[PDB]
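Limitations

Structures in this collection are predictions, not experimental determinations, and the ligand pose is part of the prediction. Treat each record accordingly. The example that follows, with nickel (II) ion as the small molecule, is included so readers can see exactly what is and is not provided: the inputs are given verbatim, and the output is the predicted complex.
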Amino acid sequence: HMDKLRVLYDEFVTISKDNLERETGLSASDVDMDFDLNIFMTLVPVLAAAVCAITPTIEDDKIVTMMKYCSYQSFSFWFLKSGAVVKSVYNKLDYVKKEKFVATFRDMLLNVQTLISLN
Ligand code: NI
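Predicted complex:
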């Protein structure tokens, strides 16, 4: 179950860890997708309210703004380690990887969002 989400999450984590460890010199903590799923479930409604609805056609610039508000300190693999946000990793990617990272992050949010449809 959640097989597509696993693929997206693993990519997000790999890219994030690689850049966070390189920039800070710190070592990532263990990955816990179960834990991080719950984090994303909380993030989705706040980001939708603070920025705009998360949809497959959301403007890329809006996703990048959402990245500014997502702190790695909240996730399993960087818990309370530093103040870095997802946009800080975006900023260090090359111009091609940047676009793919936007798609990966968006699609991760979209997938998590399908888990939390209203009654
Ligand atoms: Ni499964």
